[PDB]
Amino acid sequence: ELRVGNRYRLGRKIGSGSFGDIYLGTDIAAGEEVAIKLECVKTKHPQLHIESKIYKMMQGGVGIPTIRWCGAEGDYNVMVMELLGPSLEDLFNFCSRKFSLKTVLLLADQMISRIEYIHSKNFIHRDVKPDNFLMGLGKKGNLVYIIDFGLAKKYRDARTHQHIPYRENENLTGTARYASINTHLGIEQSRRDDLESLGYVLMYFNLGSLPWQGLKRQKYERISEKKMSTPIEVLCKGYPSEFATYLNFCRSLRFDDKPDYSYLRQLFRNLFHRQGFSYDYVFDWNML
């Protein structure tokens, strides 16, 4: 009877993340299903324990899943996590690659806040993308959660807020489709880069696709050439100027700058209200 420590029965694979696979679990002790992350202990650079400490620093924030680091069982490090609902990439597909402007702005408000909270606890996420935001369950079905801290990194000192130095970091960490221009140029990531990636995620929702998507490491330069050759004003054309304004404000932030989260939220909130929408948490998937 294959269980993690007498408590959660292990089920089928339900996803991949950074640095391991995710499996379904059943808490016979409570009554809920859980997600179970497993990492093969045979590596010189194990990551699961580290990732679960970041989760522990983020507990109590809105939209942060609760986890439980259960240590090593033979060949695997185990971390039990709150099972949430579908990812935004999943919901985008239910909705046939179309989100209403209201839904995008409903998401923008929450995704900006999630990123702000992470930054408040001194980490940058480094892989902002639609698969790493999931809707909650039940009474939390209106709530956007952020997940996967396996590429996350401390960007400032916890007691003195000394920001990490500006330096060339030459590993592309994260998905290339949403990577900031600073990352394509080999610069260490900071808070500005999480938000620029959110800017691309938003326009991806609006367009259904990005101009650097289906491009035939050669492909990684192809994306970066195309991403830099494509001015912001062309990428966001035929959509409210606020998306262009968002993206320009992210690219113009200084490396160590504390982003103005209220400003970005207010761009979208004011456009939201001018269209007459109400923050009622009725997304496109709430009308089937």
Numbering used by the authors: 2 to 217, 222 to 293
Paper text:
Mutations in CK1δ/ε (hereafter referred to jointly as CK1), as well as PER2, exert powerful control over circadian period, altering the intrinsic timing of circadian rhythms by hours in vivo. PER2 is regulated by a CK1-dependent phosphoswitch, where kinase activity at two antagonistic sites functionally interact to control PER2 stability. We discovered a conformational switch in the activation loop of CK1 that regulates its activity on two regulatory regions in PER2 that control its stability and circadian timing in mammals. We show that anion binding regulates the conformation of this switch to reshape the substrate binding cleft and thereby control substrate selectivity.
To test the role of Site 2 anion binding in regulation of CK1 activity, we made charge reversion mutants at positions R127 and K154, as well as at K171 located nearby on the activation loop, and measured enzymatic efficiency (kcat/Km) on FASP and Degron peptides in vitro. We observed a modest decrease (~25%) in activity towards the FASP peptide, suggesting that the ‘loop down’ conformation that is enforced by anion binding at Site 2 may be important for FASP activity. Strikingly, these mutants all increased activity towards the Degron, with a ~ 50% gain in efficiency for R127E. To further examine the role of K171 in regulation of anion binding, we solved a structure of the K171E mutant crystallized in high sulfate conditions and found a full complement of three anions bound, demonstrating that local flexibility in the activation loop allows it to retain sulfate binding at Site 2 to some degree. Overall, these data suggest that anion binding at Site 2 correlates with substrate selectivity on the FASP and Degron peptides. Notably, the change in selectivity with Site 2 mutants in vitro makes them much more tau-like, consistent with a recent report that both tau and charge reversion mutants at Site 2 lead to decreased PER2 stability in cells.
